[PDB]
Amino acid sequence: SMKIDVVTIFPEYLQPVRQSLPGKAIDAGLVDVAVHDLRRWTHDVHKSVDDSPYGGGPGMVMKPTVWGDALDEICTSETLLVVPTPAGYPFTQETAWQWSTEDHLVIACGRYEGIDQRVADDAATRMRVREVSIGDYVLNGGEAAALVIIEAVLRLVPGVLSLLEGPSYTRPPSWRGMDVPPVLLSGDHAKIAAWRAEQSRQRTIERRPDLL
Amino acid sequence: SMKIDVVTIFPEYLQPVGLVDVAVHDLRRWTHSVDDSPYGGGPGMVMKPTVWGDALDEICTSETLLVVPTPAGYPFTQETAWQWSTEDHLVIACGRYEGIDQRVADDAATRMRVREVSIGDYVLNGGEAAALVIIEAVLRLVPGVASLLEGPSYTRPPSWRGMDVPPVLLSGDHAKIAAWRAEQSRQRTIERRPDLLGFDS
Ligand SMILES: CN1CCN(Cc2ccc(Cn3ccc4ccc(-c5n[nH]c(N)c5C#N)cc43)cc2)CC1
Numbered sequence: 052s053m054k055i056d057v058v059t060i061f062p063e064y065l066q067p068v069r070q071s072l073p074g075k076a077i078d079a080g081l082v083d084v085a086v087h088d089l090r091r092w093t094h095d096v097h098k099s100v101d102d103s104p105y106g107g108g109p110g111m112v113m114k115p116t117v118w119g120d121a122l123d124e125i126c127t128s129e130t131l132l133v134v135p136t137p138a139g140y141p142f143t144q145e146t147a148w149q150w151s152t153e154d155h156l157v158i159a160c161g162r163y164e165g166i167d168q169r170v171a172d173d174a175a176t177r178m179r180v181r182e183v184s185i186g187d188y189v190l191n192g193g194e195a196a197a198l199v200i201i202e203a204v205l206r207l208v209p210g211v212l213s214l215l216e217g218p219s220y221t222r223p224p225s226w227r228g229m230d231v232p233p234v235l236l237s238g239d240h241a242k243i244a245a246w247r248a249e250q251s252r253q254r255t256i257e258r259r260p261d262l263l
Numbered sequence: 264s265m266k267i268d269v270v271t272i273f274p275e276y277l278q279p280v281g282l283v284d285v286a287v288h289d290l291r292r293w294t295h296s297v298d299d300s301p302y303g304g305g306p307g308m309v310m311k312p313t314v315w316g317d318a319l320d321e322i323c324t325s326e327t328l329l330v331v332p333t334p335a336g337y338p339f340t341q342e343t344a345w346q347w348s349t350e351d352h353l354v355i356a357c358g359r360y361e362g363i364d365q366r367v368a369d370d371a372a373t374r375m376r377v378r379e380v381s382i383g384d385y386v387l388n389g390g391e392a393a394a395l396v397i398i399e400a401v402l403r404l405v406p407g408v409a410s411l412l413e414g415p416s417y418t419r420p421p422s423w424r425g426m427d428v429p430p431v432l433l434s435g436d437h438a439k440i441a442a443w444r445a446e447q448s449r450q451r452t453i454e455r456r457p458d459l460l461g462f463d464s
């Protein structure tokens with residue numbers, strides 16, 4: 052039973068998450084995913100969510116007052132507040148396992164240069180807060196990271212949906228002059244696992260030597 | 264100028280997307296099941312090469328960069344995004360199940376450039392979420408649109424819930440501000456990503 056709240060100035064960007072949720076997991080009450088438009092908590096008629104950064108520099112910073120109101124309404128003390136950011140701790144598979152058992156996740160999606168730091172600092176005095184990054188590249192905002200995080204976490208929730216894996220093959224046995232490696236049709240399953248382990252080692256050495 | 268074609272059995276997931284166009288293609292429009300059991304055994308299903316071959320035949324040219332998301336890929340990083348930002352034609356083949364038969368990539372590599380990549384060390388259900396991340400990271404670099412973590416940012420008001428913006432940022436002194444931000448960045452980097460500065464995780 053997990054509730055996920057996403058807060059964003061582009062709620063439309065989260066459409067694919069609602070498209071990938073099975074009706075049975077929802078109706079069995081295993082998961083609920085709500086998306087909230089941040090501008091619902093703005094204070095002015097211009098619906099301002101950003102302002103110039105103290106200290107100068109390019110770009111804008113999301114206003115603490117607007118985010119404070121949104122999180123105040125949506126979070127409780129039991130909430131896990133996830134804040135995507137290019138300067139976060141790495142989001143990995145272990146992170147996903149750990150979060151997959153939470154009752155309530157709130158994902159605060161920023162834009163521009165990100166969110167006034169006091170928002171997270173304030174939230175952390177009464178709930179668990181995690182600033183994370185989904186990888187070493189730069190995005191426009193937190194929304195794509197939210198999709199990735201939701202997908203990686205939810206697929207580890209029952210019934211919701213070391214080395215690199217080597218190549219896989221299926222039918223037909225021959226295709227455009229390429230044969231499936233004969234060892235896979237040998238019926239020697241110890242030897243098949245050895246071949247796969249060695250493909251796995253070579254691939255890891257070639258593509259991800261850092262893991263070794 | 265860039266053309267991006269994404270190929271998937273779940274084009275419904277890609278709905279979010281002048282000098283750059285992005286098209287989404289339903290792989291199923293090339294079937295006369297897309298999946299079967301893996302040779303050698305194992306759990307799950309593998310996408311058959313036949314369907315993929317026909318689809319990519321029609322969409323790709325020798326100039327095309329074929330991008331294949333996979334948990335076993337080379338790391339997709341900011342350097343990759345820079346590299347790809349000057350391509351004319353990207354084709355992103357999104358798999359599902361346990362992935363795509365290896366021969367699809369091996370075949371395509373005889374005719375064009377192929378890049379198997381991963382967007383991070385976690386597991387997804389398919390390549391669609393990766394495609395969105397790759398598209399976003401690359402397109403924001405397309406012409407006409409160091410190795411440290413950015414420190415904290417603040418805006419108005421200068422005091423909020425009894426929390427003050429660090430006084431140096433209000434000081435208006437650029438050299439003190441640049442020094443403070445430098446220190447902030449390096450301390451964040453060593454705390455959150457020591458690997459970027461060459462230490463153990
Ligand atoms: C270090 N350098 C130099 C300074 N820049 C400053 C900067 C700051 C924000 C933005 C855009 N943005 C706004 C909210 C937000 C959330 C997550 C992400 C995100 N990007 N990449 C990931 N793995 C992300 C995740 N998760 C990006 C976001 C772009 C550029 C940062 C990089």
Ligand SMILES: CN1CCN(Cc2ccc(Cn3ccc4ccc(-c5n[nH]c(N)c5C#N)cc43)cc2)CC1
Pocket residue numbers: 214215216332333334336357358359360361362363380381382383384385386387388389390391393
């Ligand atoms: C250790 N091994 C043991 C076996 N499994 C095998 C396996 C293989 C595919 C899938 C799902 N899937 C299908 C197509 C496809 C493309 C990209 C991604 C993807 N995941 N994480 C990234 N950074 C991705 C990217 N980019 C996942 C995909 C799930 C599980 C994996 C872990």
